[PDB]
Amino acid sequence: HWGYGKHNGPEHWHKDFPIAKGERQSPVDIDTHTAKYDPSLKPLSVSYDQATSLRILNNGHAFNVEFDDSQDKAVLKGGPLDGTYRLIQFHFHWGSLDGQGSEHTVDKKKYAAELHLVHWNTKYGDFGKAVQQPDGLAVLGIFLKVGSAKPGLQKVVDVLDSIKTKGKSADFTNFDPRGLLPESLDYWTYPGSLTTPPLLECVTWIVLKEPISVSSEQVLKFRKLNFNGEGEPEELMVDNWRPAQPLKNRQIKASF
Ligand SMILES: Nc1c(Cl)cc(S(N)(=O)=O)cc1Cl
Ligand SMILES: [Zn+2]
């Protein structure tokens, strides 16, 4: 019954998921002075103009904006990646207050939230097969800081009222994820894992350097969500982030 609380939070996950203390766990702190520019990186390609969103879902840990991944359309390629990776969902991690909420950190700085756009390697045919492979997934990570509103986010913010509790979903078509990207695609990359159970070490992390700004009101609405199910005592969905994990035998590379 894993979660983020005292008796079920990240310090407990290793019991049911021993890979929590593995060799390539995420997230990590990005030490900007130890990251090295890698000229072997090729241009990053984020091709989301044919993306088809379908639904949004409160899964009791975050909320997922789900996409139609039955065909080739919204894909991530280039950069550190070999081949083609298809967009399946995005979600966020956020805090109780603006000084925390991100998973990755930058020189130990915690941002207010972190967006994860999740893609799977089409050479493995389905998501399920891809998460049995050391290069099965690519997650594009984008930090959120609080200041001006992100217009492209507001459609998400306004449907959250309709999925307050665990297991609730709503139709969510025609959402364009290009509206959540910053201007620059400068990034850091490293091999890692899912940041929640089952913590599978199947992910190429691509973390953009440029945060997007969202408004206080927008993130305040994220914090109105619930971890609990309908009719249960209210546990606000906040601080659904895993702290930074040991880097071990890894190097973080810069695209810039
Ligand atoms: N299933 C799943 C889990 Cl458990 C974690 C992540 S994450 N947060 O992007 O690493 C992404 C997915 Cl798709
Ligand atoms: Zn995530």
Side-chain angles (χ1 to χ4, degrees), residues 1-5 7-49 51-71 74-160 162-256:
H1 34 231
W2 68 270
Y4 292 90
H7 307 279
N8 70 356
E11 304 316 315
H12 304 264
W13 294 353
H14 70 103
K15 283 176 287 157
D16 280 335
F17 309 91
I19 199 58
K21 293 175 179 304
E23 296 305 306
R24 71 175 262 197
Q25 290 290 292
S26 295
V28 300
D29 179 58
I30 301 165
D31 193 84
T32 66
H33 294 103
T34 302
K36 190 184 192 192
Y37 172 60
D38 184 355
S40 79
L41 290 168
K42 282 319 188 330
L44 195 62
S45 170
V46 187
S47 300
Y48 287 171
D49 76 304
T52 321
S53 69
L54 297 175
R55 185 177 86 130
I56 187 171
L57 168 76
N58 176 337
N59 62 18
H61 329 127
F63 63 84
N64 287 344
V65 170
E66 295 157 4
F67 287 83
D68 185 343
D69 58 335
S70 67
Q71 273 184 125
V75 300
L76 184 67
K77 79 168 50 54
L81 304 170
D82 178 338
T84 286
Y85 290 68
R86 187 183 291 183
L87 181 67
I88 177 177
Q89 54 119 303
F90 68 78
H91 63 275
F92 307 77
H93 306 263
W94 60 90
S96 44
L97 295 183
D98 292 4
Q100 60 188 35
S102 64
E103 300 214 293
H104 295 88
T105 51
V106 179
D107 293 336
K108 304 294 234 217
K109 174 188 176 82
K110 294 174 169 86
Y111 285 86
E114 183 170 335
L115 172 59
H116 290 163
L117 295 123
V118 188
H119 316 72
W120 57 272
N121 192 331
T122 63
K123 78 196 263 159
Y124 301 121
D126 67 47
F127 180 91
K129 281 303 230 263
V131 298
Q132 303 171 60
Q133 320 297 331
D135 61 350
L137 300 181
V139 185
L140 180 58
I142 304 178
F143 298 118
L144 282 62
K145 63 176 202 211
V146 172
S148 57
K150 195 70 170 176
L153 179 58
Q154 193 53 44
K155 291 189 150 147
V156 178
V157 155
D158 288 319
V159 74
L160 294 185
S162 74
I163 58 149
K164 181 171 31 69
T165 49
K166 182 177 42 165
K168 282 191 82 180
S169 65
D171 290 321
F172 203 64
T173 63
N174 296 112
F175 182 77
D176 190 342
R178 298 184 291 183
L180 300 171
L181 306 182
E183 300 186 352
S184 198
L185 294 182
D186 286 349
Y187 64 85
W188 299 285
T189 184
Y190 79 96
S193 75
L194 306 170
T195 63
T196 71
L199 300 163
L200 301 169
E201 291 179 337
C202 296
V203 180
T204 298
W205 278 96
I206 297 163
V207 181
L208 298 192
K209 175 166 191 212
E210 191 179 334
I212 61 169
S213 165
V214 305
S215 75
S216 193
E217 291 93 346
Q218 285 176 322
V219 79
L220 277 160
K221 272 141 197 247
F222 288 15
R223 309 179 175 133
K224 284 190 45 262
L225 292 163
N226 285 189
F227 288 118
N228 53 281
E230 180 177 10
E232 298 174 4
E234 187 165 49
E235 318 161 37
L236 302 167
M237 192 183 278
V238 300
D239 292 311
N240 59 352
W241 50 279
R242 184 192 204 195
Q245 299 303 304
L247 187 59
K248 303 297 236 309
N249 202 21
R250 292 180 283 180
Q251 256 166 183
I252 301 175
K253 301 298 197 177
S255 73
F256 59 95

